[PDB]
Structure 1
């Protein structure tokens, strides 16, 4: 694999978002992955709808949580592969409730054909990301309320509870690290991003890695 990758500098990553009071991290993780995969398939970088998932994917639980792999399966099985534009289905859950699903009045921004579940191995995840792009992952975020910048050490690694997006890595740094897009505004972390140490399963980062497939 390359020594380092950062998709943020290569036109593939949209702006950092704010999930607000809703437990919708799973939707921000899945949609951020689709946005990146859609661009890397040769389509324009398009802002896509988390609200579509939060309100309409009834195989997940709205502001009470969900699984990125359930979301990817719902898009293909129940929604004809479609992911709506943000502009046409804007985020409406910042107060902490999921409003009722709207089943018309939206425009398709992207489509997916399926998804892949990656091995529980940090080097194998990095190799896949270097070629195919950003990867949805779950982490234990319980220590992330102390993060201020730099490469975090000693992440509490007990129980997966938070969905986020791997956008790069650097194996050549003094301490090798992952680069992760969070959904807690740009005032948090490094303009909304966090770096964690790579190679010791920090925050359980290797355990539930997956990606949509755009054909």
Structure 2
């Protein structure tokens, strides 16, 4: 009984597209994006969250800052730390720096996170429909993705198991009148608004877990 389409951007859950620049911090942007949606669902206030706070401070939890990391380890950091600072108060500079977490500037918290049944696009569809934006890993390691500009993205060389890039599923939809025709996942990237379609990409949906979008999906518990 899930909706034919979902787009959380239309309900105020999603901040404008950000840019990680030359830092392997996509996992931090995916995590802040999912926490931004859950915090909005809880309080009605959309507050941009600090990726730099995660880059600089979550090494104990197993992240490696600009050398990579994982969204579940970032949600683990926010839980163990008791908070996460706003983007305004702890700005992004795209380089590993000293941890400067300030509890008085915290605007978010989580108690851990929930994992979507791995490899199941229908499970991911249910989480997107009932929770809000969901953090996901994908295989983005292709020039077709770097130069992606519009339309549904399908890449034959995509893997659903060996992934390399965290992104945020903000909804799903279809092209035209038939809800089961030309389906896609609405994905927010962190390569800036100029990349792709206003910083977003439509990834083919119900095409065998294309690019691994439902392989490692999760969301923070607020």
Could you say what secondary structure the match of 2:198 adopts?
A: coil
Could you say what secondary structure the match of 1:27 adopts?
A: helix
Aligned to 1:137: 136
- Mean Cα displacement is larger for which, 144-153 or 202-211? 144-153
Counterpart-to-counterpart distance in 1, 2:63 and 2:6: 32
Answer yes or no: is 1:60 the counterpart of 2:67. no
Counterpart-to-counterpart distance in 2, 1:190 and 1:155: 21
Could you say what secondary structure the match of 2:43 adopts?
A: coil
Where do 4+ consecutive residues of structure 1 move more than 6 Å? none
Counterpart-to-counterpart distance in 2, 1:140 and 1:152: 12
Aligned to 1:146: 147
Answer yes or no: is 1:28 the counterpart of 2:35. no
Structure 1 residue 196 displacement after superposition: 0.9
1:139–1:155 CA distance, 2 compared to 1 (3 A): farther
Whether the 8 Å CA contact 1:48–1:83 is kept in 2: the answer is yes
Per-residue CA deviation, residues 150-171 of structure 1 (Å, 9 max, x unaligned), is 1112353232000000000015
Whether the 8 Å CA contact 2:85–2:103 is kept in 1: the answer is no
Could you say what secondary structure the match of 1:170 adopts?
A: strand
TM-score (norm 1): 0.93
Aligned to 2:98: 100
RMSD of aligned alpha carbons: 1.4
Unaligned runs of 5+ in 2: none
Structure 1 residue 173 displacement after superposition: 5.8
- Mean Cα displacement is larger for which, 40-49 or 146-155? 146-155
1:118–1:105 CA distance, 2 compared to 1 (3 A): closer
Whether the 8 Å CA contact 2:54–2:74 is kept in 1: the answer is yes
Counterparts of residues 1-215 of structure 1 (less than 5 Å): 1-58=2-59, 59-77=62-80, 79-80=81-82, 82-93=83-94, 97-104=95-102, 107-120=105-118, 121-143=120-142, 144-158=145-159, 159-171=162-174, 172=179, 174-199=181-206, 200-214=208-222
Structure 1 residue 113 displacement after superposition: 1.5
1:104–1:132 CA distance, 2 compared to 1 (3 A): closer
1:76–1:155 CA distance, 2 compared to 1 (3 A): farther
Counterpart-to-counterpart distance in 2, 1:115 and 1:28: 16
TM-score (norm 2): 0.90
Number of corresponding residues: 209
Per-residue CA deviation, residues 46-66 of structure 1 (Å, 9 max, x unaligned), is 011001000011121010000
